[PDB]
C-alpha cells in the first residue's frame, strides 16, 4: 500500500493517512551541490524545470569572473572559458584497492589576444585531475573514503542592532555592513543624537562627511532628510562644506602621513567602496540587501558591490528606525517593514555546502596562478609567447590537493554501520576554518532558536563539549540556490487544504501564519473546530479562527533528524534521554546475522535504501546465475549485467563490511528492488540489534546501578558475536648503508619461531597468531661503516649482497590475536606507485570473531545504556510458567528517575507483536478499536508492526491489544491484562510472590568492548630518551600517576609508598634492575636510589652557570657523580 520500494516486507502501521509527498532523496544535500559545481546536464535541466534562467555552474562562474587578464599597458589580453570533463580513469573498487584517488581530467579552452597585432590564439589546456564524488556522496583520496560536511556561516549583509543607554536610557540603533570581501563600513548613533560613520574600524566622523564626499549639496541633503531634525542637528556640527574638503579629510583620516591631492582621494575611495577589484559582496549579499531595502525586486543579478543608492537607503532606514517609524518605502521602491535584525535568526545563517567550499579553494588557486601569469606576462617578449608558457597549473592542483588533505572539513567517513555514514553526510558544523573557534562560542549560539522548526533538528547533538555547535539537517529540508534552507508547506486558501506543496525560507515563514499538521481535518478538506492552534512570529503560539490560516505543515515528523526518526514512542521520552538514545544508534556494531526489529518507525527502510550500502537492481530482469560472489541478471531487452559484492573488507573503524544475496535464480525482479543486503541489514531494512526477552526486576544485586544480567544462551547461540579486522603495515626503505629486504633468515632465531612463514618471508594465510609472533621478517644493515659509492656501485652492477643485518621484523602487538585472512604486497619494481624512498610495502589483515562477556556495553533505543555484569547459566535465569527462561534482566530503580518511560510502552507492544493478537469483532468493533486501521485487527505470531513518531499507537489501543493476545502451543496465556506475568525463581525453586513485567525489546551492542581496554604490565620496554616506561597499550606501557594521586597519597601520611612509586618504579636506572633481581631471588628490597629527573635538573642548572651542590647534615660537601 503506502510502500513505494518494490518487494519490501509489509509492515502494518498505526497512522492517519498522510501522503502529500514521500521523503526526498536523503543524500541530495551532498549530491546536487557538486552537480552544480561541475555543471552536469542534470543540474542544468533541473534548474530549467525550477524556472530559473541562465544556467551557470561554479567553474563557469569563477572562470567568467577571472576573465579577462591584461597587463598595465593593455596591449595583450587573455581569457578562459568553457570547461569540460572526461571519463573517469578507473572504477571505485580498484581505486580503493590500488590506493589511487578517484579523479577525472579537466580541460579548458584558452585564448590569448593582442590588440596591437590584432591576433588571437586558442587551444585546449589540461588543468589537472579533479576529484569526483562517487554515487554515494563520498570522495576517495589515496584509498580512504573521505566526506566533506556542510558549514554554517553568518550571511553577508546589513544588520541593524539596537542598544539601550545605561544612563540616558535611550534607544540607540547601530548598523553594520559585513561584506563577503573588502573593508568594513558602518554607521553609528550616540546619545548625543549624532550620526557618524566608521570605515575599516577607524574613529568616528559624521556621515555628513560621506554625504559631502558624494558631491551632494546642502539643499539636496535637506530635501532628502527634511522629515527628520536629528539629521539636521547632526549636519549642523559639520566642520566645512565642499566636496574637496570631504575627500581630503577622508584621505587624511584613513591614511595619515600621505600626500593630499584633489584627484587622488576620489580614486581610492571609489576603489575601496564601488570597484569590483578590491571590495565585493556576493550574490547572496545583493539579494539580501535588495530584499531588505526593496529596491528593484525584479532586477536580475548584475553587480556585486555597493551603490550610492544603497548608502542613502540605509541612512534613511537608520534615521527612521531611530525615531520609531513603522513602515518605510525608499523612493521608487516598495513598502517593507522596519525592525531590528536578529543575529542568529535562521534567515541570516547561511549553509555553505561542499560546492561553495571547493569553489572557494579553486578561486584561491587561480588567484595565485593569475599573479604568476601577470608577473611573467611582461617579462617575456610579445612575439615569442604562447599561453602554454603563461599558465602554470601548480597552484591550482596544490590547493585542491591540500584542502582535502588537511582542512578541518574533510573528515574520514564513520563506517560503524550504514546509519553512521548517512548521518555523517548530512551533518551541519558551525566550527571550521573561517568560522568561530570553540572558545569564541557563547551561550547565545548554542541553544535552539524558534526558527529551527523544520530546518535543524533540535534533539540530535553530540553530548560532549561540542554541544550545540554541531547539528543535523531535518528530514524534509532542502537547500535553496543561495545557501538558505527551505522547508515544505501545504497551501491553505480559506479553510480548504490543497495538495500543492510550496517551499518556504525563514523570512516567508516569519511573515505568514502556519498551523500544526496534527490538527483535525475533515475528509472533504475543511477544518472542523473553529479555533485551531497556530504558530506565529517570535515563537508565539495561540488559538485562531480557521478563516485566516495561511499554511499547514506536511507531516508530524517534520522537525526531527533521520537518526531520531527511528526511535519508537519518541514523544514519551524526555529530551535529555532522547539525545542519548539518538546518539547511540550511531555507535552500534554489526553482528554476524542480523534481525529486523519487531517495532520500528518505518523510516529505517528509506534510511537503508538511501545509505547506499545495499545493492539495488538498476533495471528490471530475471536472475540467471546467483553465487556468493556475484549476481548476474539479464534485462528485458536481452542485455546482461553482473553485480560484484564485497566480502570481508575492512571498514574504517575495524568492523566487517559483508554483503549477501537475498534473491534466488529464476526470480523476477523489478528496477529499484533490493537484491543484496549489506551490513546491518536484513531484507532491506536497517537492523542493528536483536530481539531479547526482557524482565524488569532487581535481582540479588548483580544489576545494581545500571548493570545488565545476560543469559548464557546468548553466548551459546552466538546471538551477539561480531567480527573485527585489524590491519598491520610494514615497509622497507632504502637506507644509506644499503637496502632493507624482506627475508626469511632472521639473525639467530630458532626455527620453531620461524615455522609459519613461507620462503618469501610472509606468514602463510590462515595461521593463527598471538602476541610476540613474527608476521613479516625484515633486516636492516648494521652501522659498522658507511659504504662508499664505489663499492656499492660495483656490487650493484653484478647485483651482489653482503652479510650485515639486524632484525626489525613486524610482530603482533600486545593484545591482538586471530587468523590472517589477506595479504597485500606492493613493490616499486612492479610498476606500482609508491611513496618515495620505499621499495616494498606489506599489509596483513588479522580477523577475530569476538563474543559477548563482562565489561561489554549494551543499550536499548531509548538511551538506557548499561554494562554487562554477570552471564548466568541458562538454568539460573527466572523462567515463565511455560518454561522459557528470560534472556536478560533489567533494573527498575532507573526508570522513574530518568523519565524514559517510553521503553516500558515499547516493551509491552513487543509482546503484543511477538505472540500475535486477534481482537474480537462480535457485536461490532469495540470503542477503542474505532480509529484503529483494519490492517491491525488480526496478526500472525512475530509479525512486525510500525509506529511513527508523534503519531501511532495510543495508550487505549495498546491496553486493548494486551487483553486480546493469542495463547501459546499449550493453550495458555503467559501474561496478564496489566502486562505482567508470574515468573518462577530458577535459583531456588519457589515462585516469586508478585507478578513481574516481561516483554520483548530491541537491544544493540555498543562499540566499547572490554578486550581492547584490559591491559597489564610488570616490566617491559623503556623509553630511550626519558628512561620512563612507554605509553599507550600497543606499546606495552604503564599507567599515568597524576598529581591528584600524589596529593591523595600524601593525605594518608603514606611516605614509603609515594617515594617508591616515584623512584624505583619509574626512572631509577640502577634501582629497577636491583629490585627485579631481589624479588626474583627472594631477598629484601634494597633502598631506593636517586631519580634521573633530579640529575637532569642539576645538569640543566649547572649549564646556566649556577653552582648547585648537595650538602650533608653537618656541612661536609657531597657529590652525586657516582
Amino acid at each position: 500500500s503506502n510502500n513505494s520500494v518494490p518487494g519490501a516486507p509489509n509492515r502494518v502501521s498505526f497512522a492517519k493517512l498522510r501522503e502529500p509527498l514521500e521523503v526526498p532523496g536523503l543524500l541530495d544535500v551532498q549530491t546536487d551541490s557538486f552537480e552544480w559545481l561541475i555543471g552536469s546536464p542534470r543540474w542544468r535541466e533541473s534548474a530549467a524545470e525550477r524556472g530559473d534562467v541562465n544556467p551557470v555552474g561554479g567553474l563557469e562562474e569563477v572562470l567568467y569572473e577571472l576573465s579577462p587578464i591584461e597587463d598595465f599597458s593593455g596591449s595583450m589580453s587573455l581569457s578562459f572559458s568553457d570547461p569540460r570533463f572526461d571519463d573517469v580513469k578507473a572504477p571505485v573498487d580498484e581505486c580503493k584497492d590500488k590506493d589511487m584517488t578517484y579523479a577525472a581530467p579537466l580541460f579548458v579552452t584558452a585564448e590569448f589576444i593582442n590588440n596591437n597585432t590584432g591576433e588571437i590564439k586558442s587551444q585546449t589546456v589540461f588543468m589537472g585531475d579533479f576529484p569526483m564524488m562517487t554515487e554515494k556522496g563520498t570522495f576517495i583520496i589515496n584509498g580512504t573514503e573521505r566526506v566533506v560536511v556542510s558549514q554554517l556561516v553568518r550571511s553577508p549583509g546589513v544588520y541593524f542592532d539596537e542598544t539601550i543607554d545605561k544612563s540616558t536610557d535611550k534607544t540607540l540603533h547601530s548598523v553594520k555592513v559585513i561584506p563577503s570581501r573588502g573593508a568594513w563600513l558602518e554607521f553609528d548613533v550616540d546619545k548625543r543624537d549624532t550620526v557618524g560613520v566608521r570605515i575599516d574600524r577607524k574613529r568616528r566622523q559624521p556621515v555628513t562627511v560621506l554625504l559631502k564626499a558624494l558631491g551632494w549639496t546642502s539643499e539636496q541633503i535637506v530635501e532628502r532628510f527634511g522629515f527628520s531634525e536629528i539629521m539636521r542637528s547632526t549636519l549642523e556640527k559639520d566642520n566645512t562644506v565642499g566636496t574637496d574638503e570631504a575627500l581630503l579629510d577622508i584621505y587624511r583620516k584613513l591614511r595619515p602621513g600621505e600626500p593630499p591631492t584633489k584627484e587622488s582621494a576620489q580614486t581610492l575611495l571609489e576603489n575601496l567602496f564601488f570597484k569590483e577589484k578590491r571590495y565585493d559582496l556576493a550574490r547572496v549579499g545583493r539579494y539580501k540587501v535588495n530584499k531588505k531595502l526593496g529596491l528593484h525586486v525584479g532586477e536580475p543579478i548584475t553587480s556585486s558591490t555597493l551603490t550610492e543608492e544603497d548608502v542613502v537607503a540605509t541612512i534613511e532606514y537608520l534615521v527612521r528606525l531611530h525615531e520609531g517609524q513603522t513602515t518605510m518605502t525608499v523612493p521608487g521602491g516598495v513598502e517593507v517593514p522596519v525592525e531590528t535584525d536578529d543575529i542568529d535568526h535562521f534567515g541570516n545563517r547561511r549553509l555553505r555546502t561542499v560546492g561553495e567550499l571547493i569553489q572557494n579553494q579553486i578561486r584561491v588557486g587561480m588567484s595565485r596562478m593569475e599573479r604568476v601569469v601577470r608577473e611573467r606576462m611582461t617579462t617575456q617578449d610579445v612575439e615569442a609567447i604562447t599561453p602554454q608558457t603563461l599558465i602554470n597549473i601548480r597552484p591550482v592542483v596544490a590547493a585542491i590537493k591540500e584542502f582535502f588533505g588537511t582542512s578541518q572539513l574533510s573528515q574520514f567517513m564513520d563506517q560503524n554501520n550504514p546509519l553512521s555514514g548517512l548521518t555523517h553526510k548530512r551533518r551541519l558544523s558551525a566550527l571550521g576554518p573561517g568560522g568561530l573557534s570553540r572558545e569564541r562560542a557563547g551561550l547565545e549560539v548554542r541553544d535552539v532558536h524558534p526558527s529551527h522548526y523544520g530546518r535543524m533538528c533540535p534533539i540530535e547533538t553530540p553530548e560532549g563539549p561540542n554541544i550545540g555547535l554541531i547539528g543535523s539537517l531535518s528530514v524534509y529540508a532542502r537547500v535553496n540556490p543561495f545557501g538558505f534552507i527551505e522547508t515544505p508547506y501545504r497551501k491553505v486558501v480559506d479553510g480548504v487544504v490543497s495538495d500543492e506543496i510550496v517551499y518556504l525560507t525563514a523570512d516567508e515563514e516569519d511573515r505568514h501564519v502556519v498551523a500544526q499538521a496534527n490538527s483535525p481535518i475533515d475528509a472533504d478538506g475543511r477544518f472542523v473546530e473553529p479555533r485551531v492552534l497556530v504558530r506565529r512570529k517570535a515563537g508565539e503560539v495561540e488559538y485562531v479562527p480557521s478563516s485566516e490560516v495561511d499554511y499547514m505543515d506536511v507531516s508530524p515528523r517534520q522537525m526531527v533528524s533521520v537518526a531520531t526518526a527511528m526511535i519508537p514512542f519518541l514523544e514519551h521520552d524526555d529530551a535529555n534521554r532522547a539525545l542519548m538514545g539518538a546518539n547511540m544508534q550511531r555507535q552500534a556494531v554489526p553482528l554476524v546475522r542480523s534481525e529486523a526489529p519487531l517495532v520500528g518507525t518505518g523510516m529505517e527502510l528509506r534510511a537503508a535504501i538511501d545509505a547506499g550500502d545495499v545493492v539495488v537492481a538498476e533495471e528490471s530482469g530475471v536472475i540467471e546465475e546467483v553465487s556468493a560472489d556475484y549476481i548476474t541478471v539479464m534485462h528485458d531487452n536481452g542485455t546482461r549485467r553482473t553485480y560484484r559484492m564485497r566480502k570481508f573488507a575492512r571498514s574504517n573503524h575495524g568492523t566487517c563490511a559483508n554483503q549477501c544475496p537475498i534473491v534466488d535464480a529464476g526470480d523476477r525482479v523489478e528496477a529499484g528492488q533490493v537484491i543484496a543486503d549489506g551490513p546491518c541489514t536484513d531484507d532491506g531494512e536497517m537492523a542493528l540489534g536483536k530481539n531479547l526477552l526482557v524482565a524488569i526486576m532487581p535481582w540479588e544485586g548483580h544489576n545494581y546501578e545500571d548493570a545488565i544480567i545476560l543469559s548464557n544462551r546468548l553466548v551459546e547461540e552466538d546471538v551477539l558475536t561480531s567480527i573485527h579486522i585489524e590491519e598491520h603495515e610494514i615497509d622497507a626503505r632504502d637506507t644509506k648503508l644499503g637496502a632493507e629486504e624482506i627475508t626469511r633468515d632472521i639473525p639467530n632465531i630458532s626455527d620453531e619461531v620461524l615455522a609459519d612463514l613461507d620462503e618469501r618471508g610472509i606468514v602463510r594465510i590462515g595461521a593463527e597468531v598471538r602476541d610476540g609472533d613474527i608476521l613479516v621478517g625484515k633486516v636492516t644493515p648494521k652501522g659498522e661503516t658507511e659504504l662508499t659509492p664505489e663499492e656499492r656501485l660495483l656490487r650493484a652492477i653484478f647485483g651482489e649482497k653482503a652479510r650485515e643485518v639486524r632484525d626489525t621484523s613486524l610482530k603482533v602487538p600486545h593484545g591482538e590475536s586471530g587468523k590472517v585472512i589477506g595479504i597485500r604486497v606492493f613493490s616499486r619494481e612492479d610498476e606500482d606507485e609508491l611513496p618515495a624512498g620505499v621499495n616494498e610495502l606489506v599489509r596483513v589483515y588479522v580477523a577475530q570473531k569476538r563474543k559477548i562477556s563482562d565489561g561489554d556495553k549494551l543499550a536499548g533505543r531509548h538511551g538506557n545504556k548499561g554494562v554487562i555484569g554477570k552471564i548466568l547459566p541458562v538454568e539460573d535465569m527466572p523462567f515463565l510458567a511455560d518454561g522459557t527462561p528470560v534472556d536478560i534482566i533489567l533494573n527498575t530503580h532507573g526508570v522513574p528517575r530518568r523519565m524514559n518511560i517510553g521503553q516500558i510502552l515499547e516493551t509491552h507492544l513487543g509482546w503484543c507483536a511477538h505472540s500475535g493478537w486477534k481482537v474480537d469483532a462480535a457485536k461490532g468493533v469495540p470503542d477503542w478499536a474505532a480509529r484503529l486501521p483494519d490492517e491491525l485487527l488480526e496478526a500472525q505470531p512475530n509479525a512486525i508492526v510500525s509506529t511513527p513518531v508523534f503519531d501511532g499507537a495510543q495508550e487505549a489501543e495498546l491496553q486493548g491489544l494486551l487483553s486480546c493476545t493469542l495463547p501459546n502451543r499449550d493453550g495458555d496465556v503467559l501474561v496478564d491484562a496489566d502486562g505482567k506475568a508470574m515468573l518462577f525463581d530458577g535459583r531456588s525453586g519457589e515462585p516469586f510472590p508478585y507478578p513481574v513485567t516481561v516483554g520483548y525489546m530491541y537491544i544493540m551492542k555498543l562499540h566499547h568492548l572490554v578486550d581492547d581496554k584490559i591491559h597489564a604490565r610488570s616490566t617491559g620496554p623503556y623509553s630511550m630518551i626519558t628512561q620512563q616506561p612507554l605509553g599507550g597499550k600497543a606499546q606495552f606501557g604503564g599507567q599515568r600517576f597524576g598529581e591528584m594521586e600524589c596529593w591523595a597519597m600524601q593525605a594518608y601520611g603514606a611516605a614509603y609508598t609515594l617515594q617508591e612509586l616515584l623512584t624505583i618504579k619509574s626512572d631509577d636506572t640502577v634501582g629497577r634492575v636491583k629490585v627485579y633481581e631481589a624479588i626474583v631471588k627472594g631477598e629484601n628490597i634494597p633502598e631506593p636510589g636517586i631519580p634521573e629527573s633530579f640529575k637532569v635538573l642539576l645538569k640543566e642548572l649547572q649549564s646556566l652557570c649556577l653552582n648547585v651542590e648537595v650538602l650533608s647534615s653537618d656541612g661536609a660537601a657531597i657529590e652525586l657523580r657516582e
Partner: protein, 50 residues
C-alpha cells in the same frame, strides 16, 4: 560436532565457488545439527555433493 575440514579453504572468513552461502553461514547451520553417538573416540564423517 567439534571440527570440520573443507576442501579448497583454509579459514572460516571466506567463501567457496558455486555455493550461495559462504563458510560462516555453513558453520552456523552445521552448529544446529543433531547427532547421536556412543563411541568414546573422535569419529569422522564425510559429505560431498556436486
Amino acid at each position: 560436532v567439534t571440527s570440520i575440514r573443507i576442501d579448497g579453504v583454509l579459514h572460516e572468513f571466506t567463501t567457496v565457488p558455486g555455493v550461495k552461502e559462504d563458510v560462516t553461514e555453513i558453520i552456523l547451520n552445521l552448529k544446529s545439527l543433531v547427532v547421536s553417538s556412543e563411541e568414546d573416540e573422535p569419529v569422522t564423517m564425510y559429505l560431498r555433493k556436486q
